[PDB]
Amino acid sequence: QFNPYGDNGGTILGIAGEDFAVLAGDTRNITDYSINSRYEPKVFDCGDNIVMSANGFAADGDALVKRFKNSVKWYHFDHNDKKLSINSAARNIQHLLYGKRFFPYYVHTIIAGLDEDGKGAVYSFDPVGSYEREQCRAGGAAASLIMPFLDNQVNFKNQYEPGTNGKVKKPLKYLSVEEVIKLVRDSFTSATERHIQVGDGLEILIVTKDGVRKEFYELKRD
Amino acid sequence: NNYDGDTVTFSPTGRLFQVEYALEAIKQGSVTVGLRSNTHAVLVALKRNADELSSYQKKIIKCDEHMGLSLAGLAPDARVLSNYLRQQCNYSSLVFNRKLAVERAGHLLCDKAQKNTQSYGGRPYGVGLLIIGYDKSGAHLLEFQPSGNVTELYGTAIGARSQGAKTYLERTLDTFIKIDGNPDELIKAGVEAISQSLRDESLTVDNLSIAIVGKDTPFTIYDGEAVAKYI
Amino acid sequence: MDIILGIRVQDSVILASSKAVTRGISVLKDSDDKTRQLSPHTLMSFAGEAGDTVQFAEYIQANIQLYSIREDYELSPQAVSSFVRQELAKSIRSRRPYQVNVLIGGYDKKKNKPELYQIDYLGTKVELPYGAHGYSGFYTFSLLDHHYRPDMTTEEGLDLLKLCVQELEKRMPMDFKGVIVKIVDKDGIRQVDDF
Amino acid sequence: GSRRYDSRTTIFSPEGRLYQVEYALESISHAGTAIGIMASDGIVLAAERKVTSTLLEQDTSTEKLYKLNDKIAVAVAGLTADAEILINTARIHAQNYLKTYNEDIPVEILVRRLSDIKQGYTQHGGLRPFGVSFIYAGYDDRYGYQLYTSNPSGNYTGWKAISVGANTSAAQTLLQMDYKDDMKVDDAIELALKTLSKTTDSSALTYDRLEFATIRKGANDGEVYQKIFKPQEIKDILVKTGIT
Amino acid sequence: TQQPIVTGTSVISMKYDNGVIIAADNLGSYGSLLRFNGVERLIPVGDNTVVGISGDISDMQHIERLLKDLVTENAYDNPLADAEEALEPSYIFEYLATVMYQRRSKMNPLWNAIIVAGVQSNGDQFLRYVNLLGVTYSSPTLATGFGAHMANPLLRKVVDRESDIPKTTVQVAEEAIVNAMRVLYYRDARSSRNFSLAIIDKNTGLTFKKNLQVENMKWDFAKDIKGYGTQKI
Amino acid sequence: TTTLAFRFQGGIIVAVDSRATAGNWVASQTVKKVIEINPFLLGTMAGGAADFQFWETWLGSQCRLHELREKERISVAAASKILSNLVYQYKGAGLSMGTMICGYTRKEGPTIYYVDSDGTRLKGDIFCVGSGQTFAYGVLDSNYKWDLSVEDALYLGKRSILAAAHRDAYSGGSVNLYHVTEDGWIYHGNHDVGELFWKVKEEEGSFNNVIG
Amino acid sequence: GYDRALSIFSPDGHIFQVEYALEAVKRGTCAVGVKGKNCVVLGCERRSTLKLQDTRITPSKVSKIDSHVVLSFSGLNADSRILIEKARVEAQSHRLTLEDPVTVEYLTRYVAGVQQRYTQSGGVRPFGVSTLIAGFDPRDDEPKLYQTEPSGIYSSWSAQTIGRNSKTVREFLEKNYDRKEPPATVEECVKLTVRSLLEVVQTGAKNIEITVVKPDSDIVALSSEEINQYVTQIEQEKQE
Amino acid sequence: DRGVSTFSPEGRLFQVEYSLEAIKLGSTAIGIATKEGVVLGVEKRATSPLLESDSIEKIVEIDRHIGCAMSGLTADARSMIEHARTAAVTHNLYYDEDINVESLTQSVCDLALRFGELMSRPFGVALLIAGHDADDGYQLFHAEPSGTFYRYNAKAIGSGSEGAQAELLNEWHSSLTLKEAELLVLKILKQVMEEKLDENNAQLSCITKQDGFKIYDNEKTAELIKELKEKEAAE
């Protein structure tokens, strides 16, 4: 019997800073035990300083991104070129996803950008449209490997102040863009080591008030 | 007389009066000008107000990053037709990853307007459109009439007293066609062209409306203090 | 939903309906009234699939109330029961049938007679002196066969009903949290508060 | 297009009248007179056939009086073909009610639905109205014996005695004169015939030019019987009242 | 819901400095039966694109008709149909990719794996894959079916990343393709010796090679192999 | 999930956890499970996240349209019934919902309605919904009285979620408190179970099963 | 389907089909609505050219939409049934979804909305009917009286009349009705309603119908003798 | 007869032009826009003294940040308001934000020309749509049955519109306070109204960023009427 879904692997990662936000994702595309492409990007600039990635089943992922990109275009036409805020984009994406509640997009969507106060924002979605703003989110095949590491290093979970008898927690603070990229690179090299569907390359998209910059790094190709 | 009750009726001399009456709605509309060189295409439009307390009716509409039009006549009909163009441009991009040709854009508008002139119940569109764009075969300018007739031109004008600007462009043809790689000079020529259609009124800062598209220039519209340069 | 009983006596119809609403391993509520008044002298109790029961009961209630306003007249219990049966008979061959069983107790004012109708989710109607739906019948019917008489009073009917509830509380596996009892007679519908 | 040939059947006049309903009523006023009289112990339906021919088959004929169910009948005035369309609808409606509630349909409910159908043709659809006026004679256990009338407007009213069709003005005056509330069926039979005899456009009223029917409780104990009179039974009742 | 009946096996392809190469054998299998031998599974579109199709042949023939019809439709009211407004490989791919995904979304897929190889108007090499699921991806080397498992490893030794493309000539690239086709004949039980090959170059244009055969095969070592362990004769 | 809401002398307490799970994977510890529908109406979420997040939001749009059309705030009964009638149309399609529409109006007073995806709609004083509902019931029932103070009621709601958060593997993260009065709903903070458990253990002397 | 636009504008800006529907209302029998301090009363004319009528079964002029709301009308009798039916259905639908009976304003707004829809829908003519809708909101003791008309406009009235010779009875009510002090009792309200109809009717025998509506679904129709007592009392006070 | 969507020889749609005549017969409605807010006011015009004037609802809320006043065949406005409210709430659902006043007006105006042989005739009512958003600030729009809408600093519609508009031409300036605008609507309404202006036969409303759209009480308007009369007598 025909199975309309497939798994293209890969993994993605979104972190938010004070005045910036990054959305990273490996460039490997796979089916079963074969590599389809070593460089197939799945993190996209969608305009209005919104970056997006829909990881899982690539056909559904591409369709969704394509539709959201189009949703941004028609938002400009219908509302006098108004800039689509990240919170508004998130709600719009929920309706795109939930519109196919009974034949879902098999993807884990993450978007990143700046909120209306200029502060870094990351939203993550399930396949049927539930969403939540977070400082930190990993999605895709290696999400279970990367996420607990982020809890520890970004949000300082389980880390207490030395000598305080485990009474005072390590205080939360924003990370610099330099420190965030370090965590992203270490997260993906660790994920590459222990997950077969992760490797080849790492593409990071950084979002500041000035625009959308890109950075690329090699990953192990085995 | 007896043959103008609807669009489905021919007159004894072979005329469609409802289509001609729709054409008349364009003549009453405010003037708008279109012209192009080899590198850029420009729309200039005189906007109209109800009174001093009102705003000025927007004449220019964007269809894609590389295409858009100006209007003269029934504005709601221009909204319908522009929306159709937006969808057709968009269909071409999603399905074929292809920017819609300005010539095909005209063909699609022609065929949409025509269907309204051959069926009972409906009515012709009551608006004329000047479509500009830049595609794989360079700059383009199209004139749309609600009879269905679409015409590609170097320059033209439609609306009230459009004959003055049309005569000017007919004289200036050899000059403005060679304004390549110079946006401001091509606009200046368009602003001087529309000025030949003015009576008692002159071009002010919230009156003039300019749009441009070209080789390394997306379709963008200029209003307000952004057109003060050209007065 | 589980236990609904009905007893027709000389001058009235008595409906008893369990108060428990259970979901999974939790009794969510112990004061649920599994009945709707269709008209001043007609009462319908119900039991079955969650959601379907109330949705169906209220749908019938609305239709009978609409009729009452239109004609300025109360439909007979027989007429109401036939309407209800037809709706269930339509339902059973639908894409998604109403899985609801009902008892209709009413007092016909023209005949001056109490009437009890039992209708299952298939649209199977029967007029009875006493009726029940679900597993309740497997205990109560045999008990009522023995103790029931056709000329009983309302008070005798309530004692006969107590005897049924006691038996169910003794031998039924589930705790149904007692019953709400309602009486239908010439003067209309009223609820017994202490049972 | 087709706008040119549209009569616009469902519009108002400047005076606030429905052209087509008024003209349909004008049509009905030329149709054979039909009378309904309601007594305490029954109902009479009398109707005059339209100018009869001697070679018309009289015994196996039905023009004016139709049976809707065992408890309800109607007298027709207007286009017979139109009336039959409505009668079959009314017959079906009665059976739907019986199927649903296991009870014979109350007279008014049947009358209202039939009148609501007529109303529809005056407000939407762009079709001509039904050129028919009914006299409904029936019984139910709520109101007992009932007479109603409905017309192309879809408006219906209840009556003790009423006429439709031709010469209703003269016929209504005569009924208003001799009618009283404690009247019996046999008296109402005589009134119905006497009224037609005086309002007829014919020279003399005969058995072959009439249709007659009664709805009595004259069956055995608490049940209603519908009698559609045979030709010979009309001949006898006409002699018995001294008209021929 | 379908099941494929008459099927075509691997389609292989790669990029080189000036263009792209694509190849696929001429077989139409009917399960284990090697039913049809004269089946062309490379279909050119204009003078700048070649679409290589594997999977169900009835669906392949349907796609042929769609592409044929696309060329006709593009020529309508188009004075520049053989110039600036000619069909690009990217246009042809996106159209097919749209169709493939729409059909999978209606639970009635075109049971195929497709590779669109060509050269754009600006000289850029185009090579992209799409299948019954609507999944799309691009890579210096692309292959379907068994080709994905056996050809890609060999072709990736020549062009392992982007920077290796300018360093790869058409001679070296074609040699690697022809070798891959031989390996597939050794190891794929639904392959044939006969195949077609197509080159799309930005300078020399479209070159379509028919009736090629796998040759220079190694079989002589078979004579020395006896039994399955202990046998000596 | 674990969610509860109970009615008492001083109005309505509403308490929820903040965990989200995909099987045994803890997806989030910071999910909002209370919907602020309007200043007088709250909605709790237990079941499918998307279904709740989508439809209870939609419910709020329908409640806004009601007060525009009728020039009056919607009743808790009418609000709950819009949702219950909606999910009943989708019955069998596979929606997963157990919600509580909580609010105050003049005509009704403080009111709680249980609504779930198979069409059940129940008015009641106490409800607990979710995978850890039984754990919450245990503590809530055994300590519940109508005459609880606002201070004690808030704590019991908080303590009941904590009880479930501890025992139920699919409940945890943090507690979100709400108090609904005649004047409207009042938010009473986010309470991380990480710190709250030990604070409650020490001060209350409970949770002796755990290694202190 | 029949599509023709029957209701359309004319050069002077009028919709004649709506205006001609008002003429049908002007032809209809007079109907009056008067609201007191704790009640509303609906009075209705019945023309006396129809003797030999059966008043038991003849459709009554005042109709119950729900147990707490009533509707009277003037104009085409057949048209009124369609509005009444739709109103009764909507009343039950409101109870089903909102779990509360309709307000009088809501019910009026619905009926008025139906009437309006028939003024700009293809293939239909407007309703030749104006209505008086009266009653009491659930758990409320403030009397409500609304009017609707074919165009679709609706509004609340302290007292109002519609139908034939309605301008005469409106003239009467305008000087006889005090806003500062409405009819304090049921008797006072009914008397003023009967008085107003006696300016137009003819005889006070079987020509006047009166229906009294009080709070909490308390609606009753008066009989001939009960109404006749008001007629007898008013005439004796008049001779002065 | 003749088609519904027919053009006149002059190039106008007959039915649209005829609907404009219906609007001229309608009661007066005035709107004035300022940097402190937008004010909307209407003539109620009760046909008879027995009619309870508070039930006359010619000013209407679309959303918290958008209000609306009407003139002409006011029954036709009900479906326009219904659409506007749905459009406003629907956009909030899809985008988690308030909808622009211009976008709302455009949505309403899309209904206008959806008639022919869709509804049977154009709307016989004009609308003044007033509101506020973060991008373009305080706005006032005039929405016609032609499908056209103009933005206005001030605008009058209805029977006394041409006389009131000429008065608004002289009186309006870019520095008007909200209180000044309130009095100005009352002043101009009193000039064009048939019967004498008071709190019962005229109604005021406004929309501000802070408090949103509010219809004024009869007590509040009565004081503004008294304040207006005193100021005119003071010079």
Ligand SMILES: *[C@@](C)(CO)[C@](*)(O)[C@H](CC(C)C)NC(=O)[C@H](Cc1ccccc1)NC(=O)[C@H](CC(C)C)NC(=O)[C@H](CCc1ccccc1)NC(=O)CN1CCOCC1
């Ligand atoms: C307690 C915490 C759990 O019992 C509560 O009941 C909460 C309620 C809160 C969130 C409002 N419920 C859940 O957390 C809920 C449990 C659940 C899941 C699925 C169906 C019913 C109940 N969890 C979810 O809804 C999660 C939300 C997080 C962000 C992942 N989402 C999913 O499980 C999604 C969508 C589920 C779905 C429903 C209907 C059709 C299709 C899918 N599924 C996945 O994310 C799949 N999974 C992710 C990891 O990659 C492998 C696939």
Ligand SMILES: [Mg+2]
């Ligand atoms: Mg490997």
